[PDB]
């Protein structure tokens, strides 16, 4: 079992070394330029404090709005466009609650 | 990362999601977790996980 | 040369894992297929192991 | 008995079972 597991694990490692896929990161909202003026303001403030002496904590992911629930919007769109019966019979068009 | 060999990694992601996130991202995390369990639901990974479990 | 012939006959007669063949020529052909094609069929082999996914 | 069997057959098990189910010359004249 040990020797088959060693050959096994070398084969699986060759697999995984091929099987890796890259990482796509989101663009950072605070880029290097605004890092530069925020560190400039920070050093200005602490040097003002230095010359004076010489002389929301967490972040939460915002919820997507309920009217942007594209799935539920599409079930009600599908029901309004599919189970509707013939247009020669008149009748009321069900509301396409589309939103955005 | 396979869940039955990285419990501390999955706990760390749970901590990150309860400190920064909502229940939609939490159910996305659990959907991803059980999808990774399905992916690693093989005989080879079973051998490795059982060996690690009875070696620990 | 005869000794290597005996040794390779013995190691080919050993069987590790699943029988995928029905005779010895089939066993040799399946081993040759594994030597050539396994670098292309790993995802399909994983699917046949676990039972699902592409 | 219709309770599910503890051991479920597989194609490789079938193949393994199919595999499983698969002079002194005395004279110059005989030579």
């Amino acid at each position: 079992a040990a020797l088959k597991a060693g050959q096994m694990q070398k084969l699986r490692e060759a697999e995984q070394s091929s099987k890796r896929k890259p990482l796509i990161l989101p663009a950072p909202q605070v880029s290097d330029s605004e890092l530069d003026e925020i560190v400039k303001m920070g050093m200005i403030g602490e040097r003002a404090s230095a010359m004076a002496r010489e002389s929301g904590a967490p972040i939460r992911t915002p919820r997507a709005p309920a009217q942007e629930d594209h799935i539920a919007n599409e079930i009600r769109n599908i029901k309004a466009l599919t189970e509707t019966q013939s247009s020669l019979l008149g009748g009321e068009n069900a509301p396409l609650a589309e939103g955005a | 990362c396979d869940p039955r060999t990285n419990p501390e990694f999955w706990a760390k992601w749970e901590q990150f999601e309860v400190q920064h996130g909502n229940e939609d991202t939490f159910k996305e995390m659990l959907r991803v977790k059980r999808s990774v369990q399905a992916k690693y639901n093989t005989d080879v990974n079973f051998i490795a996980s059982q060996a690690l479990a009875r070696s620990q | 040369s005869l000794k290597r012939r005996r040794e390779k006959l013995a190691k080919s007669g050993e069987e590790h894992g699943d029988v995928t063949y029905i005779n010895e020529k089939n066993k040799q052909f399946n081993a040759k297929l594994a030597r050539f094609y396994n670098k292309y069929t790993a995802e399909i082999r994983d699917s046949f192991e676990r039972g699902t996914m592409v | 008995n219709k309770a599910p069997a503890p051991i479920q057959i597989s194609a490789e098990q079938l193949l393994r079972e199919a595999v499983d189910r698969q002079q002194r010359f005395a004279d110059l004249e005989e030579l």
């Binding site: 079992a1 040990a2 | 005989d43 079973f46 051998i47 060996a51 009875r54 | - | 051991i7 597989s10 098990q13």
Partner: peptide, 29 residues
Amino acid sequence: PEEEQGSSRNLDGRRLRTVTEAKALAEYL
């Protein structure tokens, strides 16, 4: 009998030879 039917499956879709080899690798570790 399990050794005879090592390529067959459990109820959770796992080969009996893989159960046996996992136990053996556990003992080896």
